[PDB]
Amino acid sequence: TSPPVFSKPMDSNIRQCIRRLKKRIFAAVSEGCVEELVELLVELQELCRRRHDEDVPDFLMHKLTASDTGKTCLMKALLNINPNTKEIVRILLAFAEENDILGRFINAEYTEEAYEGQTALNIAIERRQGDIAALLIAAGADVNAHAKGAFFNPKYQHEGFYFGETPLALAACTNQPEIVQLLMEHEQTDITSRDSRGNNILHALVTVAEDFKTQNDFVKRMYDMILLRSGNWELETTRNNDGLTPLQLAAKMGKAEILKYILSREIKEKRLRSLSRKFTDWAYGPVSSSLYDLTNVDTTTDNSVLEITVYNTNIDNRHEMLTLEPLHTLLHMKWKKFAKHMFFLSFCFYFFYNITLTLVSYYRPREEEAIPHPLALTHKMGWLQLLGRMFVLIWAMCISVKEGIAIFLLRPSDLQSILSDAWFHFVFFIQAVLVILSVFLYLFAYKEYLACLVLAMALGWANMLYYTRGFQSMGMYSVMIQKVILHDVLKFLFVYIVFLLGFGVALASLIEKCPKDNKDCSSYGSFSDAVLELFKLTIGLGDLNIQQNSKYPILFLFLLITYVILTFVLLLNMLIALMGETVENVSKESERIWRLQRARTILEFEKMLPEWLRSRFRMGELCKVAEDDFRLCLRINEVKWTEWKTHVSFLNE
Amino acid sequence: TSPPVFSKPMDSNIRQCIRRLKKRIFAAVSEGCVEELVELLVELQELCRRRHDEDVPDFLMHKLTASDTGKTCLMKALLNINPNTKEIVRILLAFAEENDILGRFINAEYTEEAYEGQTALNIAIERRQGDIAALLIAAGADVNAHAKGAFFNPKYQHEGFYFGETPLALAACTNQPEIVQLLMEHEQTDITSRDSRGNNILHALVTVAEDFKTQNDFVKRMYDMILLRSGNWELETTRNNDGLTPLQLAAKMGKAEILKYILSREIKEKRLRSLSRKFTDWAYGPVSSSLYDLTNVDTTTDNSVLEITVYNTNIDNRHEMLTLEPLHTLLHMKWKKFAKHMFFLSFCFYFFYNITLTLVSYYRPREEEAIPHPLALTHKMGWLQLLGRMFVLIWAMCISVKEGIAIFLLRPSDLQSILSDAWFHFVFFIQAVLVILSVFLYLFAYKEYLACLVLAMALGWANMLYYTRGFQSMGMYSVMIQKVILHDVLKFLFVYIVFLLGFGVALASLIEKCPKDNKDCSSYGSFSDAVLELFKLTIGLGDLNIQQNSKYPILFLFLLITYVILTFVLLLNMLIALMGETVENVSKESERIWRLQRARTILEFEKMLPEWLRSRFRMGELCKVAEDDFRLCLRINEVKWTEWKTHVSFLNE
């Protein structure tokens, strides 16, 4: 989108159009001027020794610090890498040593609010200068820095560089394993240290990964190395300010590959046997067992990876994120255990509810038809009453409440994206409200119950099409009728409704008054009649040259002909082309959308259950893995024939 | 297209079917006849020494020059390269030295008007003969040649070989860097020298480049080498006879890659720091700043690169030419600064104008309907008058003038290509003229104002569809409704209008006169009625066997059936197939056309502004780059995540 905008830049080589010794020093450090550096430092020290001792450190720092932002000559030298930067770095460090300012000088930080908190080690590590990083780390550097500020903590991507506000995080995110090892070995580096939002190095690595495989073993390898060399089950347990762990964060942001690696991370090497989650039990060829860990990947605690992966619509990579067992096996087990039967019961109850509405609407023509009303509570009807009158009115509320909650909990910015069941949550609620209001209307006198009851019946019969997601083959349609009617038949109206309006008045103006023939006498009378006739022309009912027309018959005929040739073709057969394109696009992608909707329904029904039954319908055992650990489990026996065949073919040939 | 045609050819090995010593010499130089060369030259010199001195040079030149075209034996020898051309070249040069004709002989030029002005050095350089080129350059050659004539200066491509009419230009355009260096080092070669149209070597290189990347670093590398070794900011400032610089010429002709290279040419090496246009300020990973130069790339002077890139329709590579910052950033800044609000104001004013027209046309049925007229100037109506009567009539003129200018400035051969906003410039003007003429008609008496007013209202309501280019999603339709109606529903009529005419008279001929039944009595009466009934059959109203038919009922029924099966299908459902193909073709290419039209609108509105506001809405600062230069600037902070990630992955692995 639009380029981001920042305050004063870090290093401005090209001076804009908007004290001597400091500028001399900055220019000298910018390029290779070793002799100039020596002379400038000599004269600077001679000037410095002109006053009392206590002001020597402050004066030296002020002379070597740019008051505009707080930049130090060392940072300028590091930023402008030249084939002889090492010598100037050595000279500056020695000069700092002379006056005993090897401290603050090294650990200098910006002052401008944009790049606040930066330090020399960050710049040294960024520019690949590993040797300078080692020198600074040894001498006096402070690894536990925090590069806060807008530039290092943008509101979103494409507006800054977020890496973790820590030298170790920057080294890991810029693919510098050697610097990572050097920093980790140093005792001062505390690996677990949340910086700004709440993020240990693992979260920083997760939030800069790629959404798929291109060639990058970089992020995955760095994450694995950090987790291993850490040697503790602690990094993957911390939480950020929003309360997420690296696994949950990877699931939420949509980074599929880190999630895949971390769900099934196996450590064959002995003596760890605890940071893994895929304890393999036995394997005899194609058949392979496993003991995947469900400690935080089952909808129990509050925010299991499954719920975050299913109930989020920001990303569109979810189709590959639900075949990353134990997610797939969990969904299958729930579906075959407690979610299909509830789905069928809901279908049957809704169908009988609609049939009851219709049979108390038409079969009996709502009554004897004298001065009647529907169900209400009138007794003395027996069998048809206690079922017909009650079951509807009760069950209607049972919907109005449930969906009423859903719309209340609907998050607009995310859930309004269609294909997230909102288009049905609205219609169910509208139908229930219509039935309730239909009853309440006549309940006083209000003889208008009909319109509302008929609207409710029509909406209910139309919405009963929602339940076609239970069958795989006839499940795509329920998506098309949405995707089309909000992608090709809604943006199309804003075009059509122009022409129909345009010619709607035009034709209505050429007409001439003929009250003489006892009535209208002409097909195109008022605006409404002209619009209706144009619509019937668009669908096709008939036309003819209308008499009683003034200022021309030819103009009227020409206008009608051009409307017909401009709407019945070249518009309708263009909307149809767009509709065909949309159907083709959303017909190949049938498995993904259907499976996603089935998962959403399964999770919704699982939530609907009470705590008792849900506790009964748990999955897993109490695996004892390594000498202290009791973690949940899910024994899933996988079988892979093609993979085993290709492996054995390419192995022993 | 058709092959080009030239006059007498350069070298005619195969004599056509349409003095001795000259032919002997030409034949000897054609192939390897060293001994023949020696003998012929000896006898030629013996003959030459038969007369006085003053005629010796002229006689020698005449004997060694072909009067038909002016070709010299040296040029013939160079054209027919043989494994022993060096020896004959040496012999001819020595012989020229003997008689002191090492001048004119070397600098010989054609006489035929087609290949006029050519010289030996051109032929030597073309044939890869670098050594011969060096020899000629050393001895007496004239580098500052001009190879004029039709063959070297064709009216367009595929009719000649245009390279710059200069040995240096030919060497650079035939990928001969060594010869280029040899010529540049020679002091006589003046690099800046416009030849025929006005072209320094840079323009010649720009006008022979490729429109995209295939493998050719050739043209770009040669351009870079010439510009660098020139070492001055002068070549990119000259102008041709049409007043364009290499940057502008590259933009106009459509060569995208040279434009891309020259907009963002960065010279890292110090001591130049002035031929660049991308002074990079700082970079800390993905985030990168820049100081792109807008000295001649902003719509200020008269013909900035932006205007030439947007307001030209000859090429169709523009879609990649508007993502070559600072063009894209300039467009974004203008759009978010002063072009969106004007667009919305125009939309609102046009919408209210159309609604006023409609409400003074229908809502009031144009009046009490006794003997009325629309707005005119009749007073004593108050609120509805001062707005209804004035705003339209005034605003109409405000359109008729503006569009009236546009059509006047419309260049036919280029702008008539549709998708260049002509299809709307015509309709707006027609609508305004119709409103004005509608008023002026009745203004005397002329009770025909209706037809014109209704036409104006219909056209205005239809054209209000123009404003759908402001929204990205609903912006394609404004292009579909043009492409389809000028590419599939216009070439289709010339077919349909045959059948409807063909059967139009045929069916009208089998009818028989029945004035006996008080009136027509038969559906297919005159030609007009038959045509109308056939059209209604095509769209669908109804049909039946018409009585009162002579010479057969069977023939009439067969003709109608074959028309229905030949038009209602196999023609309409073929136009629909073509329409679907066009919609599919122009639906994928939605971003490009919409962005191009948005850019055109932005530039048009920018032009519309007065000098004051435009001066207020400038962009850039007064960058001071290298020691003398004050040039405009545009600080654009770019961010590239994927590029940085792939670079770092492939760099330190």
Ligand SMILES: CCCCCCCC/C=C/CCCCCCCC(=O)O[C@@H](COC(=O)CCCCCCCCCCCCCCC)COP(=O)([O-])OCC[N+](C)(C)C
């Ligand atoms: C008698 C007359 C009155 C009758 C009244 C009865 C009703 C008559 C009804 C009439 C409407 C009929 C047409 C419906 C469709 C039109 C488009 C639309 O609705 O949304 C569009 C605008 O996108 C949005 O997100 C809109 C959100 C609106 C609601 C926001 C609620 C926020 C507060 C919280 C809620 C508070 C509680 C609210 C409930 C109390 C959707 O388009 P999109 O976003 O581009 O979709 C993405 C599609 N894609 C993913 C394929 C790309």
Ligand SMILES: CCCCCCCC/C=C/CCCCCCCC(=O)O[C@@H](COC(=O)CCCCCCCCCCCCCCC)COP(=O)([O-])OCC[N+](C)(C)C
């Ligand atoms: C959501 C998508 C679908 C939309 C709906 C579907 C498409 C469109 C709708 C279709 C339904 C059928 C037609 C409409 C209903 C009839 C009444 C009506 O509306 O118009 C009435 C008046 O209005 C006009 O005459 C309109 C004049 C031209 C359009 C003006 C638009 C701006 C309105 C003004 C803005 C001012 C702003 C001022 C600013 C300074 C018609 O008068 P009538 O002839 O007496 O009525 C018929 C009576 N009869 C039949 C008994 C004889």
Ligand SMILES: CCCCCCCC/C=C/CCCCCCCC(=O)O[C@@H](COC(=O)CCCCCCCCCCCCCCC)COP(=O)([O-])OCC[N+](C)(C)C
């Ligand atoms: C009551 C009866 C009378 C009514 C009268 C009222 C009007 C009635 C109207 C009737 C016409 C209705 C049909 C319109 C479309 C037909 C085709 C067409 O017009 O151009 C076609 C011919 O291509 C051209 O370029 C034609 C240019 C013509 C104008 C030249 C003006 C030159 C002088 C300067 C101007 C001087 C001032 C002029 C103004 C004063 C366009 O086809 P194309 O070129 O192949 O298009 C490329 C498409 N592509 C890029 C997708 C491939």
Ligand SMILES: CCCCCCCC/C=C/CCCCCCCC(=O)O[C@@H](COC(=O)CCCCCCCCCCCCCCC)COP(=O)([O-])OCC[N+](C)(C)C
């Ligand atoms: C731009 C694209 C769209 C084009 C328009 C749409 C498609 C075509 C048009 C449709 C509109 C409706 C029909 C036309 C209008 C009616 C009048 C008419 O034109 O014909 C009249 C005469 O002409 C004929 O009878 C024509 C004979 C056959 C075609 C001859 C073509 C050459 C013309 C000659 C060249 C000579 C060259 C000589 C060289 C040596 C018909 O006579 P009529 O029956 O008395 O009229 C009806 C009267 N009534 C209804 C009151 C009874």
Ligand SMILES: CCCCCCCC/C=C\CCCCCCCC(=O)O[C@@H](COC(=O)CCCCCCCCCCCCCCC)COP(=O)([O-])OCC[N+](C)(C)C
């Ligand atoms: C006869 C008809 C009468 C009514 C006419 C009503 C007309 C007025 C309606 C609305 C006023 C809107 C004003 C704000 C938007 C300005 C344009 C804009 O921002 O476009 C954006 C694209 O936009 C999209 O990509 C959106 C895609 C969906 C468009 C749906 C249009 C539906 C029309 C009905 C909607 C209303 C529904 C309710 C109607 C009652 C791009 O612009 P940007 O983001 O600013 O660009 C900066 C960033 N960028 C350069 C990187 C892109």
Ligand SMILES: CCCCCCCC/C=C\CCCCCCCC(=O)O[C@@H](COC(=O)CCCCCCCCCCCCCCC)COP(=O)([O-])OCC[N+](C)(C)C
């Ligand atoms: C023998 C093998 C057994 C295997 C395991 C069996 C399953 C597990 C055990 C039991 C099933 C689940 C028990 C808890 C029910 C909680 C309420 C509930 O689910 O409400 C829901 C369903 O509506 C009902 O369930 C109606 C209430 C009674 C359900 C139990 C019937 C008796 C058990 C009969 C058991 C045998 C059944 C035999 C025939 C299949 C409400 O949904 P809704 O109102 O439609 O939602 C409206 C909004 N929406 C449409 C957008 C979603």
Ligand SMILES: CCCCCCCC/C=C\CCCCCCCC(=O)O[C@@H](COC(=O)CCCCCCCCCCCCCCC)COP(=O)([O-])OCC[N+](C)(C)C
């Ligand atoms: C207004 C209307 C009134 C009537 C409404 C009647 C409605 C009731 C009709 C039938 C009840 C069926 C109950 C059992 C099936 C449950 C779902 C199921 O199993 O789906 C399976 C997919 O299914 C397919 O892939 C089938 C594809 C063809 C579907 C055709 C539907 C025709 C509808 C008419 C049919 C009846 C014809 C006769 C009608 C008189 C998948 O489920 P699974 O296999 O259990 O999943 C485990 C394995 N898996 C996860 C790996 C996949």
Ligand SMILES: CCCCCCCC/C=C\CCCCCCCC(=O)O[C@@H](COC(=O)CCCCCCCCCCCCCCC)COP(=O)([O-])OCC[N+](C)(C)C
């Ligand atoms: C093939 C597809 C092409 C593309 C689509 C094209 C779509 C075109 C859309 C719309 C145009 C179609 C015609 C609409 C008007 C016809 C009725 C009329 O004119 O008058 C009638 C209504 O008169 C009124 O004043 C009430 C109008 C209420 C709105 C009715 C349309 C709502 C459509 C909402 C659609 C939402 C759909 C959402 C889901 C998609 C009655 O007036 P009358 O006739 O004089 O009768 C006398 C009775 N009276 C005295 C009581 C007045």
Ligand SMILES: CCCCCCCC/C=C\CCCCCCCC(=O)O[C@@H](COC(=O)CCCCCCCCCCCCCCC)COP(=O)([O-])OCC[N+](C)(C)C
């Ligand atoms: C607070 C933040 C401000 C940000 C910057 C604001 C913008 C910059 C500042 C100012 C806007 C530009 C000023 C110069 C206008 C020159 C004339 C001109 O543009 O004519 C054009 C528009 O028509 C008009 O502009 C009508 C004349 C009055 C415009 C100014 C209104 C008062 C300022 C209100 C300011 C607040 C507005 C608030 C609501 C948006 C004529 O176009 P047309 O006739 O349609 O063209 C016909 C042909 N065509 C259709 C093929 C093209």
Ligand SMILES: CCCCCCCC/C=C\CCCCCCCC(=O)O[C@@H](COC(=O)CCCCCCCCCCCCCCC)COP(=O)([O-])OCC[N+](C)(C)C
């Ligand atoms: C589905 C699509 C298929 C493909 C397309 C197929 C297209 C086919 C095209 C055309 C053929 C369609 C039929 C046209 C004629 C019908 C009227 C007639 O015959 O007579 C009438 C006109 O009589 C005249 O003499 C005036 C004719 C003026 C031209 C009218 C058509 C202009 C179409 C321009 C279209 C431009 C479109 C540009 C944008 C696209 C009246 O005669 P009558 O009936 O005897 O009534 C008695 C009245 N009278 C006494 C006053 C005479």
Ligand SMILES: CCCc1cc(O)c2c(c1)OC(C)(C)[C@@H]1CCC(C)=C[C@@H]21
């Ligand atoms: C089948 C796909 C889901 C669905 C269900 C509906 O109830 C309706 C649907 C779509 O489309 C709209 C909103 C245009 C209908 C309006 C009126 C009625 C009678 C029903 C509405």
Ligand SMILES: CCCc1cc(O)c2c(c1)OC(C)(C)[C@@H]1CCC(C)=C[C@@H]21
């Ligand atoms: C919507 C695309 C732009 C557009 C605008 C128009 O005004 C018209 C358009 C197209 O098509 C033609 C020229 C066939 C129409 C003729 C008659 C009328 C009433 C309008 C004409």
Ligand code: NA
């Ligand atoms: Na098709």
